[PDB]
Short mmCIF file of C-alpha atoms in Angstrom, two decimals:
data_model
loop_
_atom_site.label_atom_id
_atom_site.label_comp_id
_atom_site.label_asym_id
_atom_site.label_seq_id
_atom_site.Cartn_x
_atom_site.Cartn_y
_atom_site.Cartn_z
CA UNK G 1002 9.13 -31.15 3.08
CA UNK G 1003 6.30 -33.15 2.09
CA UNK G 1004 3.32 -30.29 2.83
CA UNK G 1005 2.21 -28.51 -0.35
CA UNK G 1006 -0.07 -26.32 1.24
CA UNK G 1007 -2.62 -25.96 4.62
CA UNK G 1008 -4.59 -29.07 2.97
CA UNK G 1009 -1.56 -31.60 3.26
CA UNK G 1010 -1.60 -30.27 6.80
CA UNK G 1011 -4.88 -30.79 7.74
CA UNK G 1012 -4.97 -34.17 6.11
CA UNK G 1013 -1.66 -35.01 8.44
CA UNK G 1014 -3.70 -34.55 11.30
CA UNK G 1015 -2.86 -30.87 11.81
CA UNK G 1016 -6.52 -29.06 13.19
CA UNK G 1017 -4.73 -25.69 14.88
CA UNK G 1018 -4.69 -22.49 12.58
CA UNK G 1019 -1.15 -20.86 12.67
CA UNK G 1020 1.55 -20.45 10.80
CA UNK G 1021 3.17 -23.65 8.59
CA UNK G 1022 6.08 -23.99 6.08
CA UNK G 1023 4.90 -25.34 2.61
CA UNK G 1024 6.41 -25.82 -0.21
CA UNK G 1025 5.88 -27.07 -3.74
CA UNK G 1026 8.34 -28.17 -7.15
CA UNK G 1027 7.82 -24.89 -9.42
CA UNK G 1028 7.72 -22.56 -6.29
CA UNK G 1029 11.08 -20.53 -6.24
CA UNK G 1030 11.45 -21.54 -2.13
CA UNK G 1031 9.42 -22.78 0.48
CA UNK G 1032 6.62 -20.28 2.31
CA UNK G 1033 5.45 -19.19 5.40
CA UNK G 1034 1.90 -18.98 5.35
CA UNK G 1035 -1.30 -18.63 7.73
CA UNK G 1036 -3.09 -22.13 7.76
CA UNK G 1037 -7.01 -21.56 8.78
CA UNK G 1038 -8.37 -24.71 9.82
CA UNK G 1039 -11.62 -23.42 11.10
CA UNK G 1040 -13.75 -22.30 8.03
CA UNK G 1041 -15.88 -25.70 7.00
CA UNK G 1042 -13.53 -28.31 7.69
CA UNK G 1043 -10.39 -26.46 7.35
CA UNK G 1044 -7.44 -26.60 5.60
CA UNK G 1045 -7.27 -23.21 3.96
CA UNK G 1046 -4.19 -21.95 2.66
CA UNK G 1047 -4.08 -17.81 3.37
CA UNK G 1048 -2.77 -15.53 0.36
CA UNK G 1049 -4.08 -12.29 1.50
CA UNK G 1050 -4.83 -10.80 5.08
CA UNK G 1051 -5.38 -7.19 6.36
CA UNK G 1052 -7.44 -6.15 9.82
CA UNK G 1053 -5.69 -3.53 10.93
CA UNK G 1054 -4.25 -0.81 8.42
CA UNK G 1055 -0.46 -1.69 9.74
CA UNK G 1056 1.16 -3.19 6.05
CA UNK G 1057 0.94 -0.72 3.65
CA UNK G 1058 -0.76 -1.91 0.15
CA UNK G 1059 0.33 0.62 -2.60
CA UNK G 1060 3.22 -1.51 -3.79
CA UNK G 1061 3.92 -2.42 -7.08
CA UNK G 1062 4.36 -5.27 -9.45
CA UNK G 1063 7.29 -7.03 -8.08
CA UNK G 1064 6.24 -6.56 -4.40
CA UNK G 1065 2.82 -8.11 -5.28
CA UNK G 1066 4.70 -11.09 -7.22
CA UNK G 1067 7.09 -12.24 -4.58
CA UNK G 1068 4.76 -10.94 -1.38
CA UNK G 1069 5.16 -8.73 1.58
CA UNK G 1070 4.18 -8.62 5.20
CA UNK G 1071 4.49 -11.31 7.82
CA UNK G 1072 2.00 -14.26 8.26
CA UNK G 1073 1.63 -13.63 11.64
CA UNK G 1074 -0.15 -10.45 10.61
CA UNK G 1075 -1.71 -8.74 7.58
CA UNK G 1076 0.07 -10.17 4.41
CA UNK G 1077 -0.11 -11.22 0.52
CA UNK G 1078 1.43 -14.31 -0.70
CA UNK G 1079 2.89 -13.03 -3.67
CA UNK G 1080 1.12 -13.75 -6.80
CA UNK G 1081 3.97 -15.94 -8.14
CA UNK G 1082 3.61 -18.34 -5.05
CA UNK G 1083 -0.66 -18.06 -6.11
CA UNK G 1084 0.40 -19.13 -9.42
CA UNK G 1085 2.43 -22.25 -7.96
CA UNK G 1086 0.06 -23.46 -5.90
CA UNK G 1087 -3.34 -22.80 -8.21
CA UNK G 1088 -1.71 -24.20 -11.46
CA UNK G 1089 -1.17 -27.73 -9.38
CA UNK G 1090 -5.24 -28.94 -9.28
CA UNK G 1091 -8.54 -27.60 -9.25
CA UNK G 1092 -8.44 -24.77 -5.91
CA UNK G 1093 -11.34 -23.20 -4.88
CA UNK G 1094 -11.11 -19.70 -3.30
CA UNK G 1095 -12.74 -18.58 -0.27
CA UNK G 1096 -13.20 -14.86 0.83
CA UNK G 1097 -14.17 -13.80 4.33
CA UNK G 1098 -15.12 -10.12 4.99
CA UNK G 1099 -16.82 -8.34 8.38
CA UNK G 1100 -17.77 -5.05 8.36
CA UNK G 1101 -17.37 -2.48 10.94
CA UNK G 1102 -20.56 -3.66 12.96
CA UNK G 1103 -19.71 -7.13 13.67
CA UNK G 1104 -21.45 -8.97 10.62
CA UNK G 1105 -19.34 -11.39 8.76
CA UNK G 1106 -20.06 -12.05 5.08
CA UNK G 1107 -17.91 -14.93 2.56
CA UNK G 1108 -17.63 -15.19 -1.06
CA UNK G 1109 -16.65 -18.46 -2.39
CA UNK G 1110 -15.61 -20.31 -5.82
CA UNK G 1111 -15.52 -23.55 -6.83
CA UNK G 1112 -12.30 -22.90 -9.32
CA UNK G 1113 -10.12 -20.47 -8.66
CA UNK G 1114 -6.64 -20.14 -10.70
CA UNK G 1115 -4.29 -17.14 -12.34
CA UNK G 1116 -2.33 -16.75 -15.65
CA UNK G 1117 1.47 -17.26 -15.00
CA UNK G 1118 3.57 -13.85 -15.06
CA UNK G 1119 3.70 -12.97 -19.19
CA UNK G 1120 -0.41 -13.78 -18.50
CA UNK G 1121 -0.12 -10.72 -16.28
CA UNK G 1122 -1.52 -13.33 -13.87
CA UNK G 1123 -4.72 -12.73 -15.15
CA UNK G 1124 -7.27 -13.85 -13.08
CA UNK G 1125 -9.65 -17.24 -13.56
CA UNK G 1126 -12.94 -17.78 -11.23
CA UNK G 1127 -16.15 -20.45 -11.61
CA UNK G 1128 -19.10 -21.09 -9.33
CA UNK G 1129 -19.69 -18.13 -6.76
CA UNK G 1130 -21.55 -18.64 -3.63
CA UNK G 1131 -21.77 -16.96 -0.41
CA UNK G 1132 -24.18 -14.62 1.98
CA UNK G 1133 -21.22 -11.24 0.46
CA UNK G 1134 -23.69 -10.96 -2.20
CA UNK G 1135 -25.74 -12.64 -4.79
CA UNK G 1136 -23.21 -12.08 -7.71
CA UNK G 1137 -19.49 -11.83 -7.53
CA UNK G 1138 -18.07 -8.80 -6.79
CA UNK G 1139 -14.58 -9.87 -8.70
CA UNK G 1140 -14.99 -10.22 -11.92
CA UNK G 1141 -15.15 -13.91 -12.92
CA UNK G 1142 -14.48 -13.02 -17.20
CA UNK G 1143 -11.42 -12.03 -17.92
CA UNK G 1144 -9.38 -9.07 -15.79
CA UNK G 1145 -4.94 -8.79 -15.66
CA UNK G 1146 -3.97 -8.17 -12.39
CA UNK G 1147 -2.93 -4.52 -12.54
CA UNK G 1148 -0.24 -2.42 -9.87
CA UNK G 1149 0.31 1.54 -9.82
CA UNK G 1150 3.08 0.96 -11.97
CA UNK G 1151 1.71 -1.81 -14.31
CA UNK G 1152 -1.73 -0.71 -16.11
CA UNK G 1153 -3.41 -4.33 -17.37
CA UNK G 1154 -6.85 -3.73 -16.18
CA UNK G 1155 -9.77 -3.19 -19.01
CA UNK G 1156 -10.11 0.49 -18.78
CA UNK G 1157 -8.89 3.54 -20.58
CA UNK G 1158 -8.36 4.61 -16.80
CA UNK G 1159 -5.36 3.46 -14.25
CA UNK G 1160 -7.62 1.79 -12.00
CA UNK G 1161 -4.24 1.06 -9.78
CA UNK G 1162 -3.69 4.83 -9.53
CA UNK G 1163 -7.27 5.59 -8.67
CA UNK G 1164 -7.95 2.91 -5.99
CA UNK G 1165 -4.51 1.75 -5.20
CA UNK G 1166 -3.06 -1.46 -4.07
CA UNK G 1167 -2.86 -4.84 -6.52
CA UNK G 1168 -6.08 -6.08 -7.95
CA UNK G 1169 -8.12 -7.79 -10.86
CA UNK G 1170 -9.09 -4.11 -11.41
CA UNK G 1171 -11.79 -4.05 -14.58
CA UNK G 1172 -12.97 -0.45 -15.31
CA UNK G 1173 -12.62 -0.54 -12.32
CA UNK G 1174 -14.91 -3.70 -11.28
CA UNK G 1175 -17.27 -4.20 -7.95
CA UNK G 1176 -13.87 -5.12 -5.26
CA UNK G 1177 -10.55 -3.82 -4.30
CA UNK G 1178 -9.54 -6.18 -0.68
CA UNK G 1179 -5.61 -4.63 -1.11
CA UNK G 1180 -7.20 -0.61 -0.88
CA UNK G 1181 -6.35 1.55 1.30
CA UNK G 1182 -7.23 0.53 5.24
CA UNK G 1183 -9.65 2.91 6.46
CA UNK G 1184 -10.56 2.61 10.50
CA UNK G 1185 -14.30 2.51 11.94
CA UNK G 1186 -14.43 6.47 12.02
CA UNK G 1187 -13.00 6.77 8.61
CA UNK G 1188 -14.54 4.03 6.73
CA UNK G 1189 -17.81 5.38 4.83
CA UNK G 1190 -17.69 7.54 1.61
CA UNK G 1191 -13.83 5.90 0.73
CA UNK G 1192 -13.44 4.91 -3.42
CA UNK G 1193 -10.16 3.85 -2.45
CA UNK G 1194 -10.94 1.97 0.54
CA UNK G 1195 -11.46 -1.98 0.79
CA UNK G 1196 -14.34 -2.73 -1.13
CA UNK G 1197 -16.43 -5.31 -1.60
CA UNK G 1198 -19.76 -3.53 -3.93
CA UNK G 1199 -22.11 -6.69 -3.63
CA UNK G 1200 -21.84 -7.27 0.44
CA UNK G 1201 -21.49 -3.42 1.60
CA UNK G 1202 -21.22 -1.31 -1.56
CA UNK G 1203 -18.98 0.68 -3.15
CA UNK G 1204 -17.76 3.33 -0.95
CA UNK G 1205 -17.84 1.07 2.16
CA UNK G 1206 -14.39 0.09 3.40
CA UNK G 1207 -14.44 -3.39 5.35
CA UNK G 1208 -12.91 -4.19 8.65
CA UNK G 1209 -11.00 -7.18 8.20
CA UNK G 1210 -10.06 -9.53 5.21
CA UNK G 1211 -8.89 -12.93 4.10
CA UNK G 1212 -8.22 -14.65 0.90
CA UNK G 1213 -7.70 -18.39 1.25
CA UNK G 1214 -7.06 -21.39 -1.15
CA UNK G 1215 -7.92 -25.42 -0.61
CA UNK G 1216 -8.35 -27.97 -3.17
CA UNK G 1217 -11.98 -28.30 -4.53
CA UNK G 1218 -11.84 -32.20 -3.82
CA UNK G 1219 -10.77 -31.20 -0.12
#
């Protein structure tokens, strides 16, 4: 009852990645969530993993509010539960990406939040590192999160429609991670694909995926 998210649990004394119950006042129930407690000291808090094609991504608004999949396996938090945890302090975000020949790249920000709901949980990013590129490949100024049946992104387009999956889509911006999941023989030459422009470019679509959250003062 008293673990908030994969910090409070590495703080406890917990070092093992696996799956942990959190839960925190504002969140609509407690969560099931992939703790990685191997990436610099641990602690991480997964809200999005994919490394094998097997959960389908095209799902729309309310699916990527509440979640979907199993975080045993390939899953997304649910932006609500991002929401709940990211409004509490100062998170940073951490992305880890490999490619299809064994090199492993990271993006990561020192302030990472979203917009509530009527904010179309627009997203908020500060102070990108990483060897996935120089410069961010998600926009860090200013994108809605957009779905194939909600169109918030910032072009005249339906980025959702064209690339698929929930995303900080701009018009339509340098990532997609919730694309379509392309395997090794199938993975160059894909627009809709999981993308990443700055580490691999933008018709490369990446192996395996995760998005994870601790605090910044972790």
């Amino acid at each position: 009852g008293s673990f908030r998210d994969c910090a409070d649990v590495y703080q406890a004394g917990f070092n093992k990645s696996g799956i942990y119950t959190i839960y925190i006042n504002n969140m609509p129930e407690p969560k099931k969530v992939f703790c990685n407690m191997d990436v610099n000291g641990g602690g991480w808090t997964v809200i999005q993993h994919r490394e094998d094609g097997s959960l389908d991504f095209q799902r729309g608004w309310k699916e990527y509010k509440m979640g979907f999949g199993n975080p045993s396996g390939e899953y997304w938090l649910g932006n609500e539960f991002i929401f709940a945890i990211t409004s509490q302090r100062q998170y940073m975000l951490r992305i880890e990406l490999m490619d299809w020949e064994g090199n492993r790249a990271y993006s990561q920000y020192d302030r990472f939040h979203i917009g509530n709901e009527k904010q179309n949980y627009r997203l908020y990013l500060k102070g990108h590192t990483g060897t996935a590129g120089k410069q961010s490949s998600l926009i860090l100024h200013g994108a809605d999160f957009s779905t194939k049946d909600a169109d918030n992104d910032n072009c005249m387009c339906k980025c959702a429609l064209m690339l698929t999956g929930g995303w900080w889509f701009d018009a339509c911006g340098p990532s997609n991670l919730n694309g379509m999941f392309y395997t090794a023989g199938q993975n160059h030459g894909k627009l809709n694909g999981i993308k990443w422009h700055y580490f691999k470019g933008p018709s490369y679509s990446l192996r395996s995926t995760t998005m994870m959250i601790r605090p910044l003062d972790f």
